[PDB]
Design a protein around this ligand. Sequence first.
Ligand SMILES: [Mg+2]
Ligand SMILES: [Mg+2]
Ligand SMILES: [Mg+2]
Ligand SMILES: [Mg+2]
Ligand SMILES: [Mg+2]
Ligand SMILES: [Mg+2]
Ligand SMILES: [Mg+2]
Ligand SMILES: [Mg+2]
Ligand SMILES: [Mg+2]
Ligand SMILES: [Mg+2]
Ligand SMILES: [Mg+2]
Ligand SMILES: [Mg+2]
Ligand SMILES: [Mg+2]
Ligand SMILES: [Mg+2]
Ligand SMILES: [Mg+2]
Ligand SMILES: [Mg+2]
Ligand SMILES: [Mg+2]
Ligand SMILES: [Mg+2]
Ligand SMILES: [Mg+2]
Ligand SMILES: [Mg+2]
Ligand SMILES: [Mg+2]
Ligand SMILES: [Mg+2]
Ligand SMILES: [Mg+2]
Ligand SMILES: [Mg+2]
Ligand SMILES: [Mg+2]
Ligand SMILES: [Mg+2]
Ligand SMILES: [Mg+2]
Ligand SMILES: [Mg+2]
Ligand SMILES: [Mg+2]
Ligand SMILES: [Mg+2]
Ligand SMILES: [Mg+2]
Ligand SMILES: [Mg+2]
Ligand SMILES: [Mg+2]
Ligand SMILES: [Mg+2]
Ligand SMILES: [Mg+2]
Ligand SMILES: [Mg+2]
Ligand SMILES: [Mg+2]
Ligand SMILES: [Mg+2]
Ligand SMILES: [Mg+2]
Ligand SMILES: [Mg+2]
Ligand SMILES: [Mg+2]
Ligand SMILES: [Mg+2]
Ligand SMILES: [Mg+2]
Ligand SMILES: [Mg+2]
Ligand SMILES: [Mg+2]
Ligand SMILES: [Mg+2]
Ligand SMILES: [Mg+2]
Ligand SMILES: [Mg+2]
Ligand SMILES: [Mg+2]
Ligand SMILES: [Mg+2]
Ligand SMILES: [Mg+2]
Ligand SMILES: [Mg+2]
Ligand SMILES: [Mg+2]
Ligand SMILES: [Mg+2]
Ligand SMILES: [Mg+2]
Ligand SMILES: [Mg+2]
Ligand SMILES: [Mg+2]
Ligand SMILES: [Mg+2]
Ligand SMILES: [Mg+2]
Ligand SMILES: [Mg+2]
Ligand SMILES: [Mg+2]
Ligand SMILES: [Mg+2]
Ligand SMILES: [Mg+2]
Ligand SMILES: [Mg+2]
Ligand SMILES: [Mg+2]
Ligand SMILES: [Mg+2]
Ligand SMILES: [Mg+2]
Ligand SMILES: [Mg+2]
Ligand SMILES: [Mg+2]
Ligand SMILES: [Mg+2]
Ligand SMILES: [Mg+2]
Ligand SMILES: [Mg+2]
Ligand SMILES: [Mg+2]
Ligand SMILES: [Mg+2]
Ligand SMILES: [Mg+2]
Ligand SMILES: [Mg+2]
Ligand SMILES: [Mg+2]
Ligand SMILES: [Mg+2]
Ligand SMILES: [Mg+2]
Ligand SMILES: [Mg+2]
Ligand SMILES: [Mg+2]
Ligand SMILES: [Mg+2]
Ligand SMILES: [Mg+2]
Ligand SMILES: [Mg+2]
Ligand SMILES: [Mg+2]
Ligand SMILES: [Mg+2]
Ligand SMILES: [Mg+2]
Ligand SMILES: [Mg+2]
Ligand SMILES: [Mg+2]
Ligand SMILES: [Mg+2]
Ligand SMILES: [Mg+2]
Ligand SMILES: [Mg+2]
Ligand SMILES: [Mg+2]
Ligand SMILES: [Mg+2]
Ligand SMILES: [Mg+2]
Ligand SMILES: [Mg+2]
Ligand SMILES: [Mg+2]
Ligand SMILES: [Mg+2]
Ligand SMILES: [Mg+2]
Ligand SMILES: [Mg+2]
Ligand SMILES: [Mg+2]
Ligand SMILES: [Mg+2]
Ligand SMILES: [Mg+2]
Ligand SMILES: [Mg+2]
Ligand SMILES: [Mg+2]
Ligand SMILES: [Zn+2]
Lengths: 70, 50, 87, 119, 102
Amino acid sequence: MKKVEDGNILVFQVSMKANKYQIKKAVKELYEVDVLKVNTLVRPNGTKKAYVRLTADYDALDIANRIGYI
Amino acid sequence: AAQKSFRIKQKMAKAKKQNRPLPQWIRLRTNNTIRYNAKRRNWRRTKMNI
Amino acid sequence: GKGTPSFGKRHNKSHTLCNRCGRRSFHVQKKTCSSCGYPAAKTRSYNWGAKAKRRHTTGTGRMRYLKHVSRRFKNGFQTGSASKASA
Amino acid sequence: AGVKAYELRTKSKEQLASQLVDLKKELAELKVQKLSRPSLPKIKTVRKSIACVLTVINEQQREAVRQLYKGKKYQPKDLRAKKTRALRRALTKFEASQVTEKQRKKQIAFPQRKYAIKA
Amino acid sequence: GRVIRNQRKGAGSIFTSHTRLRQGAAKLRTLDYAERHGYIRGIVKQIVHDSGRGAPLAKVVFRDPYKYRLREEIFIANEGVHTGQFIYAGKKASLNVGNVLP
RNA sequence: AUAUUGGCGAGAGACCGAUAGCGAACAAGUACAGUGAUGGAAAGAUGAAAAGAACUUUGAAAAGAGAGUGAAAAAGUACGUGAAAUUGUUGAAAGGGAAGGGCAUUUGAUCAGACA
RNA sequence: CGUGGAGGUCAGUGACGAAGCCUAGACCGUAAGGUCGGGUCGAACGGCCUCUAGUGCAGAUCUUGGUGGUAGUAGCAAAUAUUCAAAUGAGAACUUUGAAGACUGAAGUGGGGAAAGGUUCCACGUCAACAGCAGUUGGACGUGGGUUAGUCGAUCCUAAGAGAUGGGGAAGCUCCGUUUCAAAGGCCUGAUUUUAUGCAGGCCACCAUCGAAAGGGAAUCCGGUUAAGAUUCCGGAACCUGGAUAUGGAUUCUUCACGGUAACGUAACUGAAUGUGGAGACGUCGGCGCGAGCCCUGGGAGGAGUUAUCUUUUCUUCUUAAC
RNA sequence: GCUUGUGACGGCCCGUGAAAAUCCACAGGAAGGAAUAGUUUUCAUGCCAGGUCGUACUGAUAACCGCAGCAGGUCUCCAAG
RNA sequence: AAACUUUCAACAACGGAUCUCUUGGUUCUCGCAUCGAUGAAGAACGCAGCGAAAUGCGAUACGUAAUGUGAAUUGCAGAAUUCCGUGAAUCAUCGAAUCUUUGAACGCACAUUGCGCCCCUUGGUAUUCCAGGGGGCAUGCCUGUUUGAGCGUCAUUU
Ligand SMILES: [Mg+2]
Ligand SMILES: [Mg+2]
Ligand SMILES: [Mg+2]
Ligand SMILES: [Mg+2]
Ligand SMILES: [Mg+2]
Ligand SMILES: [Mg+2]
Ligand SMILES: [Mg+2]
Ligand SMILES: [Mg+2]
Ligand SMILES: [Mg+2]
Ligand SMILES: [Mg+2]
Ligand SMILES: [Mg+2]
Ligand SMILES: [Mg+2]
Ligand SMILES: [Mg+2]
Ligand SMILES: [Mg+2]
Ligand SMILES: [Mg+2]
Ligand SMILES: [Mg+2]
Ligand SMILES: [Mg+2]
Ligand SMILES: [Mg+2]
Ligand SMILES: [Mg+2]
Ligand SMILES: [Mg+2]
Ligand SMILES: [Mg+2]
Ligand SMILES: [Mg+2]
Ligand SMILES: [Mg+2]
Ligand SMILES: [Mg+2]
Ligand SMILES: [Mg+2]
Ligand SMILES: [Mg+2]
Ligand SMILES: [Mg+2]
Ligand SMILES: [Mg+2]
Ligand SMILES: [Mg+2]
Ligand SMILES: [Mg+2]
Ligand SMILES: [Mg+2]
Ligand SMILES: [Mg+2]
Ligand SMILES: [Mg+2]
Ligand SMILES: [Mg+2]
Ligand SMILES: [Mg+2]
Ligand SMILES: [Mg+2]
Ligand SMILES: [Mg+2]
Ligand SMILES: [Mg+2]
Ligand SMILES: [Mg+2]
Ligand SMILES: [Mg+2]
Ligand SMILES: [Mg+2]
Ligand SMILES: [Mg+2]
Ligand SMILES: [Mg+2]
Ligand SMILES: [Mg+2]
Ligand SMILES: [Mg+2]
Ligand SMILES: [Mg+2]
Ligand SMILES: [Mg+2]
Ligand SMILES: [Mg+2]
Ligand SMILES: [Mg+2]
Ligand SMILES: [Mg+2]
Ligand SMILES: [Mg+2]
Ligand SMILES: [Mg+2]
Ligand SMILES: [Mg+2]
Ligand SMILES: [Mg+2]
Ligand SMILES: [Mg+2]
Ligand SMILES: [Mg+2]
Ligand SMILES: [Mg+2]
Ligand SMILES: [Mg+2]
Ligand SMILES: [Mg+2]
Ligand SMILES: [Mg+2]
Ligand SMILES: [Mg+2]
Ligand SMILES: [Mg+2]
Ligand SMILES: [Mg+2]
Ligand SMILES: [Mg+2]
Ligand SMILES: [Mg+2]
Ligand SMILES: [Mg+2]
Ligand SMILES: [Mg+2]
Ligand SMILES: [Mg+2]
Ligand SMILES: [Mg+2]
Ligand SMILES: [Mg+2]
Ligand SMILES: [Mg+2]
Ligand SMILES: [Mg+2]
Ligand SMILES: [Mg+2]
Ligand SMILES: [Mg+2]
Ligand SMILES: [Mg+2]
Ligand SMILES: [Mg+2]
Ligand SMILES: [Mg+2]
Ligand SMILES: [Mg+2]
Ligand SMILES: [Mg+2]
Ligand SMILES: [Mg+2]
Ligand SMILES: [Mg+2]
Ligand SMILES: [Mg+2]
Ligand SMILES: [Mg+2]
Ligand SMILES: [Mg+2]
Ligand SMILES: [Mg+2]
Ligand SMILES: [Mg+2]
Ligand SMILES: [Mg+2]
Ligand SMILES: [Mg+2]
Ligand SMILES: [Mg+2]
Ligand SMILES: [Mg+2]
Ligand SMILES: [Mg+2]
Ligand SMILES: [Mg+2]
Ligand SMILES: [Mg+2]
Ligand SMILES: [Mg+2]
Ligand SMILES: [Mg+2]
Ligand SMILES: [Mg+2]
Ligand SMILES: [Mg+2]
Ligand SMILES: [Mg+2]
Ligand SMILES: [Mg+2]
Ligand SMILES: [Mg+2]
Ligand SMILES: [Mg+2]
Ligand SMILES: [Mg+2]
Ligand SMILES: [Mg+2]
Ligand SMILES: [Mg+2]
Ligand SMILES: [Mg+2]
Ligand SMILES: [Zn+2]
């Protein structure tokens, strides 16, 4: 949540099967948003986390409570 | 260790998840018989053998 | 020093996990598995070792496919579908 | 609720394709909800409906192909019968009933007579 | 009793040669057309130590009669031969140290 | 027509009865051991029904004491019965380098039968 | 005489208490044993005639399980060492904080990694077991959170070696062979303007592949930031590789740059096949020379300590990454 | 001075102290190219992109192997007065 | 005289014998003939509103379609439109599908979630570079098809 308020980053759990290109395009497509870069990592419960940085036009925090979580 | 195959990472992942106590609501089920978790594992009493 | 001080340097795996049987019986330098024989096309097993067979035969698994053959056989291997009636 | 199969089957290719997209939006939302809510069993039924649609969408495209192969030598291996590997090899009734030209003559001229003892 | 030492040598486990550093095999030129009708000129380009060998080797390079390129041979150096020397190999060649003659 | 300690489906027994019977009646080829091949356990039973002890009190708590449920808590998720070794308590007795034993009787305790 | 099971029978016993267990209570038998009372208990069980056997324990360093005396006993004594107070808490020799006394003494009891472990990391809660005293503490327990890369590693390469393939052995599982007695394969563009890519040359004959998280190897640094990540995020500033490409400059009417006697210079300054050269790329010890970081040190500008006495003093800050 | 780095030297050897990927250069001159305008991206500037997996912590008189929080064993870098 | 030791009993301990149970085991007998390149047996990782396992299943994941039944499921929550009904159910049946990563396991590898090639399509100003979607490429052998090789060899040109 903090990365969302302070960083303009959306954090998703994301398919293991999917790559940085695929994560980027799918956010871009599903959320009407532009993306700067996308870091990923495997969590220790064996699931994938994507830090998704939006471009400076977007306010990810705004975009968080529009997908509807807080 | 400290620089693993994904194979090994995976297994370790699966392991972490099996490392909870018995979800106590099972205790309430009709004919329930499982008292506690009889397959619990602990990093310094039993080694995973990978 | 052949006992415990020499045990101190046990920190290299002779065997890792077997792909075909997932067992840590995969000898690294020999590149074959001491349980199941991989990657021999056949599966290691021996008549002098019956517990071992018992430990691994069909039915000790899911039988994802074989499960359903005996029902299918009973119905004469029906194709198509079932229709309708009433009540 | 939970979509019905027989009601899906009267819709069109791109009605089902869309319904699918709706349940998928649906399902995406519940999962956002689920992690704010101490239980969310409604999700179970929206993810069973997706299955249902996919089933039907697949069902239809399949008996599409099956027909446009109905009645030819050669048709996709997975519309062929399954039976059993052995069964599947196994001489056809034709290539099995086959009888030597010479033998046929014999089968005709001297077949097993029905008869009876008594008088 | 046990298998004696000189029987274990044949399986060449710990017993093979220590080869990693050797220059290559020492060999005369392939007895081609030049060498058996006339002679052919070369140049010793280098005379050099072969590990685990007594005598130095001589890298000697020749022209390919059939392709435009240099094919280099490895000789065992005779006493006297030198970097820069011209070596003659062939039936109709002359009788000085270094040359190769039938 | 013959074979069959495998497979599927069935009917059976002067068979075993939880240390028995298959190793496994149970999350058993599990847990655990071994580098590996392999080795491989223990472990069933509250009650008809959880009615699984509200409430009060002492306690930091675990629990104890009451109360309550119940046909029974001399059934309390240590739970049917609940032997023995071995232990606590109470009561009785004996004991100057073991104890226990045989025949016999005193003393104490305890008891049957028979009288009519 | 006694046990488990079987045929017959007593229309046998029993929830108004079967079986079992307990009892220096009673009775029958020479004895194996039988019978009863009382207590406990809870669902089955026995007499007689016969049938049947996995049918009787004190021993087998017997098997499994349980239990003693030993005994509150041996012991809990290596690694110099502890102390006062507060706070917390039901509880403090042992937790937290402050004070003091010491230790490791940079060949560390410091700061990091390789193998190996796999969540032990971090927060919060927390003491039944566990840490051979304790426990409010923990690498324990419950619940959660945490591991961000074009530039770090892997990935590529080849080493000892491993190992498919035409093959040759072997009844066969398979053994031998690795470029070997093999018809072993693919790049550059041209020919197309039926059109997407057939033929036209010319090559090149290299013959799998796996095998290094210390060998070889394209390229990133400083500052900042977290409870827990950082050469990975944030900030700033770079670099390499692939792909596209235009603008500028350079060059040409002596077409494919000039200058320098030369070593050679430069912002550029076309170049296919084929060939060659170099780099990758390399022992060890010794003294000598130089660099960097550390060490020592003067002045000055700050801050701290000592000051009964003495000391223009003791201690410390004064730095500069890749590119 | 100390640690490290590096240079030109020197001693030693019946020891003379890897390989390959990969990069560049040169010899060659097939070819393609200007004046009504051509050639040039090994000069400068400019555009786009860079996947996958590992990354926590311990590395030891308690996070590894020795039945264990065992006086044992277990490869290494930094190093003040 | 206590204490202590020992013996007996009662109440209480310790331990789990004994009795009685039995969705198991064993053995006999009868009927039956069905694994797999249409990817088997086996492995690994996953999947539930709230599961660590056992059981089930595969990104359509304790299930989807169909069929029969005819009102449950149940530990708690839940749906509530599903109860004179194309209809409950952790139901039965099962003819239709889905079926991750693998395995004889098949593009090459594999202590790597490592590395190619080909076709169709979509995006990036692209036959060539990058990216997303789909579909493909193991080996031996048989019949056939096509392209070929060899003075092995027959004819036919001028
Ligand atoms: Mg903001
Ligand atoms: Mg990453
Ligand atoms: Mg050992
Ligand atoms: Mg080894
Ligand atoms: Mg082998
Ligand atoms: Mg194989
Ligand atoms: Mg349904
Ligand atoms: Mg067929
Ligand atoms: Mg011999
Ligand atoms: Mg050799
Ligand atoms: Mg049988
Ligand atoms: Mg019968
Ligand atoms: Mg048993
Ligand atoms: Mg018996
Ligand atoms: Mg047993
Ligand atoms: Mg049972
Ligand atoms: Mg156990
Ligand atoms: Mg009972
Ligand atoms: Mg019991
Ligand atoms: Mg019960
Ligand atoms: Mg009480
Ligand atoms: Mg009663
Ligand atoms: Mg009772
Ligand atoms: Mg009772
Ligand atoms: Mg209770
Ligand atoms: Mg009891
Ligand atoms: Mg007497
Ligand atoms: Mg008798
Ligand atoms: Mg009897
Ligand atoms: Mg018996
Ligand atoms: Mg007695
Ligand atoms: Mg009597
Ligand atoms: Mg009584
Ligand atoms: Mg009784
Ligand atoms: Mg009863
Ligand atoms: Mg008898
Ligand atoms: Mg016996
Ligand atoms: Mg006896
Ligand atoms: Mg005995
Ligand atoms: Mg005895
Ligand atoms: Mg005896
Ligand atoms: Mg005994
Ligand atoms: Mg004590
Ligand atoms: Mg003592
Ligand atoms: Mg001692
Ligand atoms: Mg003392
Ligand atoms: Mg000490
Ligand atoms: Mg202390
Ligand atoms: Mg000191
Ligand atoms: Mg020292
Ligand atoms: Mg220490
Ligand atoms: Mg560390
Ligand atoms: Mg560890
Ligand atoms: Mg901690
Ligand atoms: Mg405690
Ligand atoms: Mg511990
Ligand atoms: Mg303790
Ligand atoms: Mg304690
Ligand atoms: Mg924890
Ligand atoms: Mg956790
Ligand atoms: Mg690098
Ligand atoms: Mg790569
Ligand atoms: Mg071979
Ligand atoms: Mg390799
Ligand atoms: Mg490397
Ligand atoms: Mg390296
Ligand atoms: Mg963070
Ligand atoms: Mg850190
Ligand atoms: Mg930093
Ligand atoms: Mg940055
Ligand atoms: Mg910038
Ligand atoms: Mg470029
Ligand atoms: Mg110029
Ligand atoms: Mg070269
Ligand atoms: Mg070289
Ligand atoms: Mg080297
Ligand atoms: Mg740099
Ligand atoms: Mg050094
Ligand atoms: Mg030298
Ligand atoms: Mg060069
Ligand atoms: Mg030409
Ligand atoms: Mg350039
Ligand atoms: Mg690529
Ligand atoms: Mg780290
Ligand atoms: Mg430690
Ligand atoms: Mg350990
Ligand atoms: Mg162990
Ligand atoms: Mg130790
Ligand atoms: Mg007195
Ligand atoms: Mg009593
Ligand atoms: Mg019994
Ligand atoms: Mg009963
Ligand atoms: Mg039976
Ligand atoms: Mg029968
Ligand atoms: Mg098998
Ligand atoms: Mg279930
Ligand atoms: Mg449910
Ligand atoms: Mg119906
Ligand atoms: Mg069902
Ligand atoms: Mg699917
Ligand atoms: Mg393969
Ligand atoms: Mg793969
Ligand atoms: Mg594909
Ligand atoms: Mg053919
Ligand atoms: Mg032909
Ligand atoms: Zn295996």
